[PDB]
Design a protein around this nucleic acid. Structure first.
Ligand SMILES: Nc1ccn([C@H]2C[C@H](O)[C@@H](COP(=O)(O)OP(=O)(O)OP(=O)(O)O)O2)c(=O)n1
Ligand SMILES: [Ca+2]
Ligand SMILES: [Ca+2]
Ligand SMILES: [Ca+2]
Ligand SMILES: [Ca+2]
Ligand SMILES: [Ca+2]
Length: 903
DNA sequence: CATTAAGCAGTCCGCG
DNA sequence: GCGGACTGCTTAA
């Protein structure tokens, strides 16, 4: 097999590398790496090295990495560019692995762990580590085993061994319900004292040294706690045994009333699953507790126990250990679904970076571009300092706030990367400039053609047409990868709807799920067999189709985020290829493209409808347009349609056969206008929206920019079994909105769009009447808690104190002196409730850590003093008023002359 | 070591 | 009692 790296570090003049050899064995080596950098030389000097602009360079080979670094400083002082890769471990990886890395994940040790620490005096701070570590569960991906380290004797209580037999039993029979499929994979190790537990854990660690280290909050809790605890008991150099190279770096962050730290373990790549989830999931959650995320991702119930966590070990050690084990398994279950570790490995090896560098689009692209240029013997430019400077982005049309009955949307494929490729935007492809006209002159095709020689953007930039740029070249590679996975995702999505259709008439038989590949559209023969399957088989097939869709989503959406990241990186001062000429060449082209095609679509539809001057395009944002299809439906006549699916089919055909070719013609003309390298402005129909035929539903509405709702029947070629609400920007979509309120507002919208005014009024009336019965957490608002200290004046609110921050200070005063009440952590999220006048908290609101029950001592008073009237008005009534006024609809029946009668 | 556009909630201030 | 300027937060893209 081909060799591949596991980890790489620079430590002084040494590169320390862990890797897999040609026999598939894990190895380590220390290399006194000899780096090269480059300097511009005169043309007369023959050389094989040229910078990206074609200027000759001389190679400077250094005896060590420090010498190379000192030379960079001298060059800076002289005032001359020092070219080449200055991150030497990236150069080392590039020299060592001068081919496309093919990696085998089964050879990569992936460790998932978590620890328990009993603390009778508040949160056990990792930097102090003053309490015993009383449980560790460490899953090893190579052994496929959960290694469980259990402390039986502690200053906080002596306990009996954990029972695997009780652990497996149902909770309803007094067991812990540890999942049956991991029971045989548990290796249990009790210890009489913490010192022997910790010594054994370190010996184990040496035997099974993580390459990838993950888990839930391991970077901020588990790692620094273990490191500091071991340091306190055995000394710092024993703690350094957690690094395979015995080197660590301690990072102390001052928070005025916090003071915590992160430990860098050299030779390990830490991928905290919380950070992976936040980067790759495209969610914004009201809480990041493992309970909440597991419930969201897996539909599993909360891990229930009686009393505080500080008393759980002494009162129920059995459950304490089982829950430590289950918590580790839950992360593995989330990853089996989301596949973020897989993604990280794919991206890291593709770029040739430390795996943890996948968090950084700048580092990722720097490496990709460096490796690409190095293949051609090209030399990369020195990174330079740049002042931060705002620049313009995308265009968003102001919509007329209204109901919109029939809507079809159209969207440009991968817009910014497509613009890069179409125009040929790269640092080395710049050909010059032209004199700009106002943007509207390009939009309306009245401005002089910029160039008949070069490829242009309406920002004034010209690019060569006849040569390749490294940015377009490398962005295309990832774009093509992305395209493949999105195809798999959409096929799985379509396959899912086929299964949902068939679940309407399940067969009464004993059968099995069909062994199929969900990444490809089912054949007719498969569809025939599906229509004869049982409900059991269908529901299992749907699970597999959806899991396939999620895997496709992870792979495609994050490759999209990477390539969009490159367009954005051009606008970040720390990017080696930072250049606002290129960053704005993209955004300005985008603005032109959207507004050009708005004009073209309006022109085309007036033409085919036999009219003039009517506005068909009602809205657009960045790369999408929304077309009112009312006149298209009316031109045929609504009574001609047999059912909803009939008009949906009609509009689908209209978009594909008539509109899309006109859109294509429009964009090909624009490409010619700008004299672009290649036409890549591909705008396809996205959504088809409207009310069910014969209903009083309004179909859709806009309240303003980035705020709308649509009743969608078909999305990007997926014909839904049941209509799906597409809601953007409205409170239903916001993590700050109370859970039960999101639910109620969504039903209000559903009724508006699908059923009409009277249906809405009936729901509103019910919700208002039952509002006070909802669980307090379900009706609490949520906010992030930043700069708490700034507004903290002796426990009371300082000037301009935000509402949520005021709530936190109220809470802090209420829990003062109580050592067991959970503290609000700076930067994390809080539930927020308004409080009625005269409450014993002495302020208008309270806030507490999100994803938790408010502490028992103050919970009673919160429930008693909650201001339901304020809560309903602020979170529910006021947003609903926005929706209904825009839609020209009432959520409550207006008084009228008819009120004089007895109906 | 490291993208912009834009809506809504809330504070402060003005307001015979 | 509301608007206008301004901060904070959180979306859409
Ligand atoms: N983080 C982001 C998100 C978006 N955009 C810009 C670039 C995108 O090309 C454009 C439109 O984003 P979309 O969500 O419409 O997705 P794309 O057009 O990129 O991809 P596709 O439509 O193929 O999914 O907005 C950006 O610069 N940075
Ligand atoms: Ca725990
Ligand atoms: Ca599309
Ligand atoms: Ca798009
Ligand atoms: Ca059937
Ligand atoms: Ca879009």
């Amino acid at each position: 097999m081909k060799e591949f790296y596991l980890t790489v570090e620079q430590i002084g003049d040494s590169i320390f590398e862990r890797y897999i050899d040609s026999n598939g064995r894990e190895r380590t080596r220390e290399v006194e790496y000899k780096p090269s950098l480059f300097a511009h030389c005169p043309e007369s000097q023959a050389t094989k090295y040229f910078d990206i602009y074609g200027k000759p360079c001389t190679r400077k080979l250094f005896a060590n990495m420090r010498d190379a670094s000192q030379w960079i400083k001298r060059m800076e002082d002289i005032g001359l560019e020092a070219l080449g890769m200055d991150d030497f471990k990236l150069a080392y990886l590039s020299d060592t692995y001068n081919y496309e890395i093919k990696y085998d994940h089964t050879k990569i040790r992936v460790a998932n762990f978590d620890i328990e620490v009993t603390s009778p005096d508040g949160f056990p701070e990792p930097s102090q580590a003053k309490h015993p570590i009383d449980a560790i569960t460490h899953y090893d991906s190579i052994d496929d085993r959960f290694y469980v380290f259990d402390l039986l004797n502690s200053p906080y209580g002596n306990v009996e061994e954990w029972s695997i037999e009780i652990a497996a039993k149902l909770q309803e029979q007094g067991g812990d319900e540890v999942p049956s499929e991991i029971i045989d994979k548990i290796i249990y190790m009790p210890f009489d004292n913490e010192k022997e537990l910790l010594m054994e854990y370190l010996n184990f660690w040496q035997q099974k040294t993580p390459v990838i280290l993950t888990g839930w909050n391991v970077e901020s809790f588990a790692i620094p706690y273990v490191y500091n605890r071991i340091k306190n008991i055995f000394g710092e150099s024993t703690a350094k045994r957690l690094s395979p190279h015995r080197k660590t770096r301690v990072k102390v962050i001052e928070n005025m009333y916090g003071s915590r730290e992160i430990i860098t373990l050299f030779g390990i790549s830490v991928l905290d699953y919380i950070d992976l989830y936040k980067k790759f999931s495209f969610t914004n959650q009201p809480s990041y507790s493992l309970d909440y995320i597991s419930e969201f991702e897996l539909n599993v119930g909360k891990l229930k126990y009686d009393g505080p966590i500080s008393k759980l070990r002494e009162s129920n050690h059995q459950r304490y250990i089982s829950y430590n084990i289950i918590a580790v398994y839950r992360v593995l279950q989330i990853d089996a679904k989301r596949q973020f570790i897989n993604l990280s490995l794919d991206m890291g090896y593709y770029a040739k970076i430390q795996i943890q560098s996948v968090f950084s689009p700048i580092k990722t692209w720097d490496a990709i571009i460096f490796n690409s240029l190095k293949e051609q013997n090209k030399v990369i430019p020195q990174g330079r300092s740049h002042p931060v400077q705002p620049y313009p982005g995308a265009f968003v049309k102001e919509p007329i706030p209204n109901r919109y009955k029939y809507v079809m949307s159209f969207d440009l494929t991968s817009l910014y990367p497509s613009i890069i490729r179409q125009v040929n935007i790269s640092p080395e492809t710049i050909a010059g400039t032209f004199k700009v006209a106002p943007l509207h002159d390009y939009i309306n095709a009245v401005a002089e053609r910029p160039s008949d020689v070069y490829s242009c953007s309406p920002n004034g930039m010209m690019y060569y047409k006849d040569r390749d740029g490294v940015v377009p070249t490398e962005i295309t590679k990832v774009f093509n990868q992305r395209k493949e996975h999105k195809g798999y995702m959409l096929a799985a999505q379509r396959n899912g709807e086929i299964i949902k259709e068939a679940l309407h008439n399940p067969n009464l038989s004993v059968d099995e799920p069909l062994d199929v590949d969900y990444r490809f559209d089912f054949s007719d023969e498969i569809k025939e067999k599906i229509k004869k399957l049982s409900a059991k088989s269908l529901n299992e097939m749907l699970f597999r189709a959806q899991r396939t869709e999620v895997a496709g989503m992870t792979a495609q959406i994050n490759r999209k985020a990477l390539i969009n990241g490159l367009a954005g990186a051009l606008g970040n001062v720390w990017f080696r290829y930072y250049d606002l000429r290129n960053a704005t060449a993209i955004t300005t082209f985008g603005q032109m493209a959207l507004q050009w095609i708005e004009r073209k679509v309006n022109e085309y539809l007036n033409e085919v409808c036999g009219t003039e001057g009517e506005a068909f395009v009602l809205y657009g944002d960045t790369d999408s347009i929304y077309v009112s299809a009312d006149k298209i439906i009316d031109k045929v006549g609504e009574s001609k349609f047999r059912d909803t699916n009939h008009w949906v089919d009609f509009l689908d055909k209209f978009a594909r056969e008539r509109m899309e070719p006109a859109i294509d013609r429009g964009f090909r003309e624009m490409c010619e206008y700008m004299n672009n390298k290649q036409h890549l402005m591909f705008m396809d129909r996205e959504a088809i929206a409207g009310p069910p035929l014969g209903s009083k539903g309004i179909g859709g509405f806009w309240t303003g920019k980035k705020r709308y709702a649509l009743n969608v029947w078909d999305m990007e070629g997926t014909r839904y079994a049941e209509p799906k609400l597409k809601i953007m920007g409205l409170e239903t979509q916001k993590s700050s909105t109370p859970k039960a309120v999101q639910k109620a507002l969504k039903e209000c919208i559903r009724r508006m769009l699908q059923e009409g005014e009277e249906s809405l009024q009936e729901y509103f009336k019910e919700f208002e009447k039952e509002f006070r019965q909802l669980n307090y957490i379900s009706i609490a608002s949520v906010s992030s808690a930043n700069n708490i200290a700034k507004y903290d004046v002796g426990g009371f609110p300082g000037p301009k104190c935000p509402f949520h921050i005021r709530g936190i200070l109220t809470y802090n005063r209420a829990i003062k002196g109580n050592i067991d009440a959970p503290q609000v952590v700076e930067g994390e999220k809080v539930y927020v409730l308004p409080l009625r006048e005269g409450n014993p908290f002495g302020d208008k609101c309270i806030a507490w850590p999100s994803g938790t029950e408010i502490t028992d001592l103050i919970k009673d008073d919160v429930l008693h003093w909650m201001d339901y009237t304020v809560l309903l008005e602020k979170t529910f009534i006021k947003p609903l008023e926005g929706f209904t006024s825009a839609a020209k609809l009432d959520y409550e029946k207006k008084a009228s002359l008819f009120d004089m009668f007895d109906f």
